[PDB]
Amino acid sequence: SKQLTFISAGATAAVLQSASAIVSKVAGGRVQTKTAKEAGRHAVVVGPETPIGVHTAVTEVPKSAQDPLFSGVSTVVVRAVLPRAAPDSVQLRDALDVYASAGIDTKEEVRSATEAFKKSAEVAVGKAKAKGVKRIVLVVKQASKHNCINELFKKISTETIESAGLTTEVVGTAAVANQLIVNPESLGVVLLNDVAATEQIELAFAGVVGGVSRVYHTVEGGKISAGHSFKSVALAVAQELRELGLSSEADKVEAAASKNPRAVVSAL
Amino acid sequence: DIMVPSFVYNKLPVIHFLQEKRAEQKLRRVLDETYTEWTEELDQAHVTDAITRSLNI
């Protein structure tokens, strides 16, 4: 009856097959599992690549799945995701910086980027207010190539955050990545500009913590789960089942993920 | 028969000269309005750089 939408973005067939087996064995057939390329709700996306239709890329440190090394840490990493076009077409992150060099008009692209950053900033400040932090950390790659996208990102993110009344501290990519992996307790809320380097940092943090499921906020309004490994995907499925209104099944999947990461399907 | 013909004959040379000068003026104006247009086209280097960004290199 119900439907779970599986999106594949750069994920090996083994992970997708494992996810399908896990849901089928745990759900028992009550909820069907259909595959697609875009969704707004009841969706799990497998693979490092960002799907189409997501504007925010928040990720946290769930208490249950905290690794012993990172016990007690509490930091929220939100990556701003610009609208994604077809693979052949030039991405908005690339276009916003190259068209300016080429002299082409960049009005519509700026407007689209501004809307995406505003939504991401609103999500980030909401998380900061909920956690109670007073200052957030913006992350922008300091490469000369990305001298326009980051500038707009800083101009808009700081504007929205300052309007909300919180402080912003701008930093690069290498320093924040090292701090987040070594001393993450000194960062409460960190926003990341849309780059192919920030995406790797978000994946690295989501994996080093012990394997977690990232939350994507889409344009349509909602939350979709995202994973890249066996444990992360299993946690993503468990959260998705919990959202559908299945508590016991979600707990079993979470327990199986904690015990046997690479073979959860057989473990449960 | 006599007067008007004589005065027309007297007129002819000046009118001919002025009309020749007018034609030369028209030709000169035609020539002066010719300019070679040089158009600027987007350098392909930017296109190559954008291609690299799509390649994610």
PDB file of C-alpha atoms in Angstrom, chain A residues 84-204:
ATOM      1  CA  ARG A  84      20.559  20.535  -9.650  1.00  0.00           C
ATOM      2  CA  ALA A  85      20.055  20.421 -13.414  1.00  0.00           C
ATOM      3  CA  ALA A  86      20.635  17.523 -15.795  1.00  0.00           C
ATOM      4  CA  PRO A  87      24.146  16.011 -15.733  1.00  0.00           C
ATOM      5  CA  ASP A  88      24.911  17.285 -19.237  1.00  0.00           C
ATOM      6  CA  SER A  89      23.794  20.832 -18.436  1.00  0.00           C
ATOM      7  CA  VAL A  90      26.119  23.207 -16.608  1.00  0.00           C
ATOM      8  CA  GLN A  91      25.418  23.184 -12.882  1.00  0.00           C
ATOM      9  CA  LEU A  92      24.328  26.393 -11.183  1.00  0.00           C
ATOM     10  CA  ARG A  93      27.420  26.308  -8.963  1.00  0.00           C
ATOM     11  CA  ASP A  94      29.649  26.234 -12.048  1.00  0.00           C
ATOM     12  CA  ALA A  95      27.541  28.619 -14.131  1.00  0.00           C
ATOM     13  CA  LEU A  96      27.284  31.328 -11.469  1.00  0.00           C
ATOM     14  CA  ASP A  97      31.087  31.706 -11.491  1.00  0.00           C
ATOM     15  CA  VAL A  98      32.030  31.152 -15.145  1.00  0.00           C
ATOM     16  CA  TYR A  99      29.305  33.198 -16.854  1.00  0.00           C
ATOM     17  CA  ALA A 100      30.498  36.267 -14.951  1.00  0.00           C
ATOM     18  CA  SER A 101      34.001  35.728 -16.329  1.00  0.00           C
ATOM     19  CA  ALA A 102      32.531  35.175 -19.801  1.00  0.00           C
ATOM     20  CA  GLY A 103      30.420  38.331 -19.436  1.00  0.00           C
ATOM     21  CA  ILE A 104      27.090  36.533 -19.850  1.00  0.00           C
ATOM     22  CA  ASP A 105      24.168  37.914 -17.872  1.00  0.00           C
ATOM     23  CA  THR A 106      23.782  36.211 -14.487  1.00  0.00           C
ATOM     24  CA  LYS A 107      20.533  37.647 -13.141  1.00  0.00           C
ATOM     25  CA  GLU A 108      18.265  34.591 -13.065  1.00  0.00           C
ATOM     26  CA  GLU A 109      21.064  32.368 -11.756  1.00  0.00           C
ATOM     27  CA  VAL A 110      21.828  34.857  -8.979  1.00  0.00           C
ATOM     28  CA  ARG A 111      18.141  34.942  -8.047  1.00  0.00           C
ATOM     29  CA  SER A 112      17.971  31.144  -7.919  1.00  0.00           C
ATOM     30  CA  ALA A 113      21.177  30.960  -5.876  1.00  0.00           C
ATOM     31  CA  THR A 114      19.908  33.664  -3.520  1.00  0.00           C
ATOM     32  CA  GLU A 115      16.695  31.736  -2.869  1.00  0.00           C
ATOM     33  CA  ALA A 116      18.617  28.526  -2.166  1.00  0.00           C
ATOM     34  CA  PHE A 117      21.023  30.254   0.227  1.00  0.00           C
ATOM     35  CA  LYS A 118      18.170  31.984   2.056  1.00  0.00           C
ATOM     36  CA  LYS A 119      16.399  28.660   2.605  1.00  0.00           C
ATOM     37  CA  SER A 120      19.639  27.027   3.752  1.00  0.00           C
ATOM     38  CA  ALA A 121      20.389  29.964   6.055  1.00  0.00           C
ATOM     39  CA  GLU A 122      16.887  29.769   7.538  1.00  0.00           C
ATOM     40  CA  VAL A 123      17.379  26.061   8.252  1.00  0.00           C
ATOM     41  CA  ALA A 124      20.804  26.703   9.789  1.00  0.00           C
ATOM     42  CA  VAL A 125      19.599  29.490  12.085  1.00  0.00           C
ATOM     43  CA  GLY A 126      16.608  27.398  13.137  1.00  0.00           C
ATOM     44  CA  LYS A 127      18.933  24.584  14.180  1.00  0.00           C
ATOM     45  CA  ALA A 128      21.211  27.074  15.946  1.00  0.00           C
ATOM     46  CA  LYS A 129      18.279  28.596  17.833  1.00  0.00           C
ATOM     47  CA  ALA A 130      16.976  25.149  18.792  1.00  0.00           C
ATOM     48  CA  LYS A 131      20.398  24.087  20.081  1.00  0.00           C
ATOM     49  CA  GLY A 132      20.902  27.496  21.716  1.00  0.00           C
ATOM     50  CA  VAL A 133      24.207  28.439  20.082  1.00  0.00           C
ATOM     51  CA  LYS A 134      24.889  32.139  19.507  1.00  0.00           C
ATOM     52  CA  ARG A 135      27.388  31.945  16.626  1.00  0.00           C
ATOM     53  CA  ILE A 136      27.516  29.744  13.535  1.00  0.00           C
ATOM     54  CA  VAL A 137      30.525  28.918  11.368  1.00  0.00           C
ATOM     55  CA  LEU A 138      30.336  29.516   7.625  1.00  0.00           C
ATOM     56  CA  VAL A 139      32.600  27.367   5.446  1.00  0.00           C
ATOM     57  CA  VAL A 140      33.701  28.705   2.057  1.00  0.00           C
ATOM     58  CA  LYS A 141      36.452  27.310  -0.147  1.00  0.00           C
ATOM     59  CA  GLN A 142      39.101  30.008  -0.560  1.00  0.00           C
ATOM     60  CA  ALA A 143      40.102  28.999  -4.097  1.00  0.00           C
ATOM     61  CA  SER A 144      40.431  31.867  -6.558  1.00  0.00           C
ATOM     62  CA  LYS A 145      38.125  30.004  -8.952  1.00  0.00           C
ATOM     63  CA  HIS A 146      35.221  30.168  -6.484  1.00  0.00           C
ATOM     64  CA  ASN A 147      35.566  33.915  -5.966  1.00  0.00           C
ATOM     65  CA  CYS A 148      31.931  34.669  -6.902  1.00  0.00           C
ATOM     66  CA  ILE A 149      29.732  31.843  -5.595  1.00  0.00           C
ATOM     67  CA  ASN A 150      31.292  32.089  -2.134  1.00  0.00           C
ATOM     68  CA  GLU A 151      31.026  35.886  -2.135  1.00  0.00           C
ATOM     69  CA  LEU A 152      27.283  35.692  -2.761  1.00  0.00           C
ATOM     70  CA  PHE A 153      27.031  32.887  -0.199  1.00  0.00           C
ATOM     71  CA  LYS A 154      28.718  35.005   2.476  1.00  0.00           C
ATOM     72  CA  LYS A 155      26.759  38.123   1.515  1.00  0.00           C
ATOM     73  CA  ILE A 156      23.407  36.346   1.876  1.00  0.00           C
ATOM     74  CA  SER A 157      24.138  33.929   4.729  1.00  0.00           C
ATOM     75  CA  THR A 158      25.528  36.665   6.981  1.00  0.00           C
ATOM     76  CA  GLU A 159      22.647  38.978   6.058  1.00  0.00           C
ATOM     77  CA  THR A 160      19.996  36.426   7.027  1.00  0.00           C
ATOM     78  CA  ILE A 161      21.815  35.284  10.174  1.00  0.00           C
ATOM     79  CA  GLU A 162      22.496  38.837  11.356  1.00  0.00           C
ATOM     80  CA  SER A 163      18.848  39.681  10.697  1.00  0.00           C
ATOM     81  CA  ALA A 164      18.000  36.742  12.967  1.00  0.00           C
ATOM     82  CA  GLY A 165      20.388  38.098  15.618  1.00  0.00           C
ATOM     83  CA  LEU A 166      23.121  35.433  15.671  1.00  0.00           C
ATOM     84  CA  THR A 167      26.809  35.823  14.853  1.00  0.00           C
ATOM     85  CA  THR A 168      28.714  34.360  11.906  1.00  0.00           C
ATOM     86  CA  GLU A 169      32.370  33.329  11.641  1.00  0.00           C
ATOM     87  CA  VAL A 170      33.725  32.686   8.143  1.00  0.00           C
ATOM     88  CA  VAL A 171      36.404  30.028   7.605  1.00  0.00           C
ATOM     89  CA  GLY A 172      37.946  27.972   4.820  1.00  0.00           C
ATOM     90  CA  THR A 173      37.714  24.281   3.994  1.00  0.00           C
ATOM     91  CA  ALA A 174      40.959  22.731   5.268  1.00  0.00           C
ATOM     92  CA  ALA A 175      40.984  24.323   8.725  1.00  0.00           C
ATOM     93  CA  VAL A 176      37.333  23.530   9.448  1.00  0.00           C
ATOM     94  CA  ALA A 177      37.672  19.968   8.148  1.00  0.00           C
ATOM     95  CA  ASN A 178      40.647  19.298  10.424  1.00  0.00           C
ATOM     96  CA  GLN A 179      38.874  20.893  13.391  1.00  0.00           C
ATOM     97  CA  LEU A 180      35.662  18.964  12.735  1.00  0.00           C
ATOM     98  CA  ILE A 181      37.525  15.645  12.603  1.00  0.00           C
ATOM     99  CA  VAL A 182      39.920  16.330  15.500  1.00  0.00           C
ATOM    100  CA  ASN A 183      38.088  18.746  17.839  1.00  0.00           C
ATOM    101  CA  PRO A 184      34.409  18.836  16.810  1.00  0.00           C
ATOM    102  CA  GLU A 185      33.108  19.865  20.248  1.00  0.00           C
ATOM    103  CA  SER A 186      34.228  23.461  19.577  1.00  0.00           C
ATOM    104  CA  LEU A 187      31.708  23.840  16.718  1.00  0.00           C
ATOM    105  CA  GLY A 188      27.969  23.945  17.335  1.00  0.00           C
ATOM    106  CA  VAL A 189      26.481  24.772  13.928  1.00  0.00           C
ATOM    107  CA  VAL A 190      28.533  24.850  10.723  1.00  0.00           C
ATOM    108  CA  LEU A 191      27.069  25.845   7.362  1.00  0.00           C
ATOM    109  CA  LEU A 192      28.862  24.794   4.174  1.00  0.00           C
ATOM    110  CA  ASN A 193      28.739  26.517   0.803  1.00  0.00           C
ATOM    111  CA  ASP A 194      27.878  24.447  -2.267  1.00  0.00           C
ATOM    112  CA  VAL A 195      31.123  22.921  -3.563  1.00  0.00           C
ATOM    113  CA  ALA A 196      32.422  19.480  -4.472  1.00  0.00           C
ATOM    114  CA  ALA A 197      34.892  19.835  -1.575  1.00  0.00           C
ATOM    115  CA  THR A 198      32.299  20.653   1.091  1.00  0.00           C
ATOM    116  CA  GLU A 199      30.289  17.615  -0.009  1.00  0.00           C
ATOM    117  CA  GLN A 200      33.289  15.379   0.677  1.00  0.00           C
ATOM    118  CA  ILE A 201      33.752  17.000   4.093  1.00  0.00           C
ATOM    119  CA  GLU A 202      30.103  16.354   4.955  1.00  0.00           C
ATOM    120  CA  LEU A 203      30.476  12.716   3.898  1.00  0.00           C
ATOM    121  CA  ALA A 204      33.711  12.372   5.872  1.00  0.00           C
TER     122      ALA A 204
END
